[PDB]
């Protein structure tokens, strides 16, 4: 297909509320959610649940880029996740990068969504993440590989929604143009359709 | 250089089964509730015990059942020849704190001082080998000077293995040689170990030897310490009336 | 052994590392059915009798032969090589890791390769009854073996047989006769012998040397036979023709090999030897020498000519590759041929591959590239290749020496006969045919005759071509260089 073999697995870990291992190709992320739980008077806010994301790679320590990425994920989830139901409590999303082969965010987002699902957390709509790489010649590639990201001039991670296939998040590396943005966004929408079909298949086989 | 001459002697001039003369004292600092000092050779530890007192910034940690032992470690910069910085906060001083804490929480018999801090503090001024045991023993003398109840002298010392023999109360030289060194701390009256640290490679059948050797060294340390303590108590009582 | 092997391969710089991943990639995937798209420029000889001769237990079989009779009394002979060039196209990493590994080492037990076993025994090789690519050189000849018409064509063939030398000889002259192979082999061995004696009359010299190849219950000595001379003559003819062609077409960049003839200050030892043994020799040229060695026979020493042949091989210089531009020698002492270039075994050499490329572009079935004409880069790779062949020789010698050490360790043989080659003041070099081994023996007051090379002790005298029995004691004092030692008795 236009994008590569990608699988998932739910309820791996016993201690966290919900967990999900989402791998595509050779990149594999692992997400664990701690549902509505305690929160101190400093971190909390009435009429909303505090969503906190902490992402940590498997090398060195977390610096700044990961903090930016986890802000992106935080706000995306705040966009979809319902929090006016569970005020004065904290939802926590932990992300670990078992492997890194490009298309990282496009994997972390999917894993976060699946974990939130497994934790039975009230969501307004599923979301997904894809990554499209524009080489110099304009030929785009979906769900790229690290080689394709290095040999390319632009890369674009889009976090889309399921209800109306809008654009919840966009993180771009490189420099690109308008028309290319639009066309890669359309291709991302198609890829998101495929990802949603996959989610439904996985959950169908989980409830069986 | 050498560790065990073919005759049986060491560098310092002592056989394997003996140790260096500890010279101690109890009552250094009066602004406290308990203090001690010890020199187990060139080493020079210094202990302090601020007694069972109130918790401030309660922060919901005042155990209601028993007392709260808080022991802090410190190795001065000029202790070793190689100057170092950040004596506190390091990942090793905190391990020493944990060790001392789980020892004295075992010995210090906290069930009688509930909701109270026993603050132990240890500073090592000079280090030439055997840096944990000197501190254990100084803190013991401190506790005792502070009239804090405690099951028994928690006496500590170190042993090692060289040329198919066991050495007692290693120094820095054979501690740098890399050989197996086993530090421990036991309660003599009962024969029970309160702590058993150890770091190097060696066979298993060669374990009982260094183990009993360290134990016997700790017994000797017990004798010396208790003679000191008895002198101290006698002098104090005589002075009272 | 698994330590000494790697140690000698690290000291002689012989690269032993396995093939990197990138290399394996550029190889073809191995569903490999002959693609009829590349077969355009080539032809189809599948309707042909071919019988590749192969020594005991080989896998990088590359050559192939045939001798098809023709209506006109003439017959078409043909040699066939594995057209590795198609697989090994330049600019890759394959080509670089094959250049550095400028030749395939063949130690007494293993073989360090230059191209994977896949491309060496499954694709390029001329395996039996499997259609494989090839380069081909075809001649038309008569029963006196003078060329009449030649051609140098790429093609695809199908080896009907992968024989052994003994199997070859028995298929030839066991009285069996068949339209398939045996007749080809016979009519080809004929031309082989004719060409052989023809070139001997041309002055080219034959030699010998102590060569022992281990299994290791008891070692064995290589045995000569017709089939070997046959295949050798045909392959040499192919090399010479290819060289003449790529020379006439290319006079600036090429790969040739020369054998710089020796200064006459080296033959004097052999001269003095045969003089003290009253056999005259003319060492002025190659012919005189050769036609003389065949006369120096005398019945007292039926095993004599071989000794002079060794004593000669101790003199010849080093044969080296080079480019037609940076030099102008173009003369090969040994074969008495002026031009000669290796063309048969690319699986076993890289200069063979470069020759395949040059010849193919001369035929027009390939495209050029800059590193094929830049004399500088070609000279550099040629120097590398010579250095590497030299390393390989040294390594194989060290290995056979180690195996001899080991065998003498397992079996302590003593007091075996031996002949003499040299005679020096301090030591007396010696040769043992049984084990195919030459060694030294020191004597550390003597009498050293140099006008006539001989040694004199108060009791006896030592001249070349005498006899002595020896006891072989290996000293292992220094585990490094566990060294043999000869003790003498009579």
């Amino acid at each position: 297909c236009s994008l590569r073999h990608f699988a998932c697995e739910q309820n791996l870990l016993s201690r966290p509320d919900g967990s999900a291992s989402f791998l595509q190709g050779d990149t594999s992320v692992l997400a664990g959610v701690y549902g509505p739980a305690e929160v101190k008077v400093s971190k909390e806010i009435f009429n909303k649940a505090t969503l906190e994301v902490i992402l940590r790679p498997k090398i060195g320590l977390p610096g700044v880029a990961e903090k930016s990425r986890e802000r992106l994920i935080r706000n995306t989830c705040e966009a979809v996740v319902l929090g006016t139901l569970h005020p004065r409590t904290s939802i926590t999303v932990v992300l670990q990068v078992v492997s890194d082969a490009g298309s990282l965010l496009a994997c972390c987002l999917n894993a976060a969504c699946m974990a939130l699902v497994d934790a039975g957390v009230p969501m307004r709509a599923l979301f997904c993440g894809v990554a499209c790489a524009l080489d110099s010649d304009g030929t785009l590639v979906l769900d790229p590989t690290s080689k394709q990201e290095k040999e390319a001039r632009a890369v674009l991670t889009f976090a889309l929604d399921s209800v109306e296939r809008k654009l919840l998040m966009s993180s771009t590396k490189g420099l690109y143009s308008d028309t290319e943005l639009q066309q890669c966004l359309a291709a991302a929408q198609a890829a998101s359709q495929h990802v949603f079909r996959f989610y439904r298949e996985s959950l169908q086989r989980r409830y069986s | 250089l050498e560790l065990l001459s073919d005759q049986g002697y060491r560098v310092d001039g002592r056989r394997a089964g003996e140790l260096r003369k500890i010279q101690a004292r109890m009552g250094v600092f009066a602004q406290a509730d308990g203090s001690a000092y010890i020199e187990q050779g060139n080493t020079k530890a210094l202990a302090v015990v601020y007694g069972p007192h109130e918790i401030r910034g309660s922060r919901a940690r005042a155990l209601p059942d028993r007392a709260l032992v808080n022991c802090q470690y410190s190795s001065a910069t000029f202790s070793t020849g190689e100057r170092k910085r950040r004596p506190h906060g390091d990942r090793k001083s905190c391990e020493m704190g944990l060790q001392l804490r789980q020892t004295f929480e075992a010995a210090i018999l906290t069930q009688l001082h509930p909701r109270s801090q026993i603050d132990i503090y240890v500073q090592v001024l000079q280090a030439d080998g055997g840096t944990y045991a000197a501190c254990v023993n100084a803190a013991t003398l401190a506790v005792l000077d502070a009239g804090i109840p405690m099951r028994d002298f928690v006496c500590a010392c170190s042993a090692g293995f060289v040329d198919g023999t066991a050495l007692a109360d290693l120094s820095h030289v054979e501690e740098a040689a890399g050989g197996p060194q086993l530090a421990l701390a036991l309660l003599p009256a009962s024969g029970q170990i309160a702590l058993l640290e150890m770091d190097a490679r060696l066979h298993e059948d060669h374990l009982e030897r260094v183990l009993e050797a360290a134990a016997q060294a700790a017994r000797d340390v017990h004798t010396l310490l208790d003679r000191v303590v008895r002198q101290h108590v006698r002098e104090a009582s005589i002075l009272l009336g | 052994k698994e330590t000494e092997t790697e140690v000698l391969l690290l000291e002689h710089d012989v690269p032993h590392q396995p093939f990197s991943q990138a290399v394996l990639s550029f190889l073809p995937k191995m569903p490999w059915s002959i693609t009829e798209k590349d077969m355009k420029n080539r032809e189809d000889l599948r309707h042909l009798c071919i019988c590749s001769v192969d020594p005991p237990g080989c896998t990088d079989i590359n050559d192939a032969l045939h001798c098809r009779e023709l209506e006109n009394g003439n017959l078409e002979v043909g040699v066939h090589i594995a057209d590795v060039s198609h697989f090994i196209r330049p600019g890759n990493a394959l080509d670089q890791e094959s250049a550095r590994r400028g030749t395939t080492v063949y130690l007494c037990e293993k073989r360090i390769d230059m191209v994977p076993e896949l491309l060496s025994s499954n694709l390029c090789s001329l395996k039996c009854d499997v259609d494989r690519l090839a380069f081909s050189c075809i001649w038309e000849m008569n029963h006196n073996a003078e060329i009449l018409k030649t051609k140098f064509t790429k093609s695809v063939i199908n080896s009907k047989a992968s024989l052994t030398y003994a199997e070859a000889q028995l298929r030839i002259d066991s009285a069996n006769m068949n339209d398939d192979i045996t007749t080809s082999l016979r009519g080809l061995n004929k031309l082989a012998k004719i060409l052989k004696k023809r070139r001997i009359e041309k002055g080219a010299l034959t030699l010998s040397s102590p060569e022992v190849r281990f299994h290791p219950i008891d070692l064995q000595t290589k045995e000569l036979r017709e089939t070997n001379s046959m295949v050798e003559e045909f392959m040499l003819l192919a090399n010479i023709s290819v060289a003449k062609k790529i020379h006439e077409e290319f006079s600036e960049h090429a790969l040739l090999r020369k054998h710089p003839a020796p200064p006459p200050s080296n033959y004097e030892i052999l001269v003095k030897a045969a003089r003290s043994r009253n056999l005259e020799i003319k060492t002025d040229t190659a012919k005189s020498l050769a036609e003389s060695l065949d006369q120096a026979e005398s019945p007292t020493f039926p095993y004599l000519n071989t000794l002079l042949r060794i004593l000669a091989t101790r003199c010849m210089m080093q044969a080296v590759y080079f480019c037609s531009g940076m030099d102008n020698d173009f003369h090969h002492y040994g074969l008495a041929s002026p031009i000669y270039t290796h063309f048969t075994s690319p699986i076993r050499r890289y200069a063979d591959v470069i020759v395949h490329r040059l010849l193919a572009v001369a035929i027009g079935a390939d495209c050029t590239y800059p590193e094929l004409t830049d004399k500088h880069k070609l000279a550099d790779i040629c120097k590398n290749l010579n250095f590497r062949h030299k390393m390989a020789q040294y390594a194989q010698r060290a290995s056979v020496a180690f195996h001899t050490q080991l065998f003498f360790k397992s079996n302590g043989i003593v007091s075996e006969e031996a002949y003499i080659l040299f005679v020096r003041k301090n030591a007396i070099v010696v040769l043992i045919p049984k084990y195919g081994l030459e060694g030294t023996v020191f004597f550390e007051q003597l009498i050293y005759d140099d006008e006539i090379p001989s040694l004199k002790i108060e009791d006896t005298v030592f001249h070349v071509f005498d006899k002595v029995k020896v006891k072989i004691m290996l000293d292992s004092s220094n585990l490094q260089h566990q060294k043999i030692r000869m003790s003498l008795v009579e």
Partner: protein, 287 residues
């Protein structure tokens, strides 16, 4: 957040089942849980899961200026992280005691035992040497870490391969995994810890305790061993009074346990190499 408290019911039930020599899942006292060793795609990744406790291990390399005292041998950098997914209480910068003790223990065990060859990994004596760091991450927390952390560090450091290097004088040339074949490490012996837990002041002892057994235990004896019966480290924590015969017996146990774990590890590496020599980027071993 905080860990849910422990009820007196569970505590008493556990103590009694110990008195009667009954574990919970159904195993004896001298038994581990099914430990699985799974590998990744990148040389140096290993996920080892004993029962429910999963731990990840990555191994990375660098070239750096060595330290003056040791200009010949290289460097090694351990680190263990307690990911918040391991358990709620593992907030960043809060459970520091556990981090400190685990990291010191692991450093001691592997480094000071001289498990690997810090000399083999020299390139330019005085200017540039290797630097091997190993990051362990705790994913699920059900009971025994030290054993898992150690098995992971070992499987990694035995399933890792360096970028080959050539050298002449001072000219050093690094190369990529696609240009040459990475070179493995140099191990002398693989140590892996073994954890005993004491109940009722020393009367009862268990192996591979779960999380509850860790909440109702008073003492922990860690013992590092090899397949050659070589004590590498031993530690007592929890403020507990043990004796001699106890440590002797625990050591005679750790012997067999480490022998078996080692056999498994070797089998796992064998299977992974076999797979990659057939097409496949994984490797799996089961107790």
């Amino acid at each position: 957040m905080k860990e849910t408290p422990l009820s007196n019911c569970e505590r008493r039930f556990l103590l009694r089942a110990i008195e009667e020599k009954k574990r919970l899942d159904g195993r004896q006292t001298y038994d581990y849980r099914n430990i699985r060793i799974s590998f990744g795609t990148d040389y140096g990744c290993c996920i080892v899961e004993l029962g429910k406790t999963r731990v990840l291990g990555q191994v990375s390399c660098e070239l750096v200026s060595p330290k003056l005292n040791r200009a010949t041998e290289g460097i090694l950098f351990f680190n263990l992280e307690l990911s918040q997914m391991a358990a709620p209480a593992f907030e960043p910068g809060r459970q520091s005691d556990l981090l400190v003790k685990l990291n010191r223990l692991m450093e001691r065990c592997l480094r000071n035992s001289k498990c690997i060859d810090t000399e083999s990994l020299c390139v330019v004596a005085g200017e540039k040497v290797w630097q091997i760091r190993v990051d362990l991450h705790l994913l699920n927390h059900d009971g025994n870490i030290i054993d898992a952390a150690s098995i992971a560090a070992i499987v990694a450091l035995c399933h890792f391969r360096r970028p080959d290097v050539s050298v002449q004088g001072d000219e050093v040339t690094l190369y990529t995994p696609e240009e040459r074949d990475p070179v493995p490490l140099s191990i002398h012996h693989m140590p892996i810890c073994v954890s005993f837990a004491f109940f009722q002041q020393g009367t009862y002892l268990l192996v591979d305790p779960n999380e509850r057994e860790e909440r109702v235990m008073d003492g922990l004896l860690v013992i590092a061993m090899n397949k050659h019966r070589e004590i590498c480290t031993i530690q007592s924590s929890g403020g507990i009074m043990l004796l001699k015969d106890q440590v002797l017996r625990c050591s005679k146990i750790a012997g067999v346990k480490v022998a078996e774990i080692t056999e498994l590890i070797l089998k796992a590496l064998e299977n992974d190499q076999k797979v990659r020599k057939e097409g496949g980027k994984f490797g799996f071993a089961e107790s």
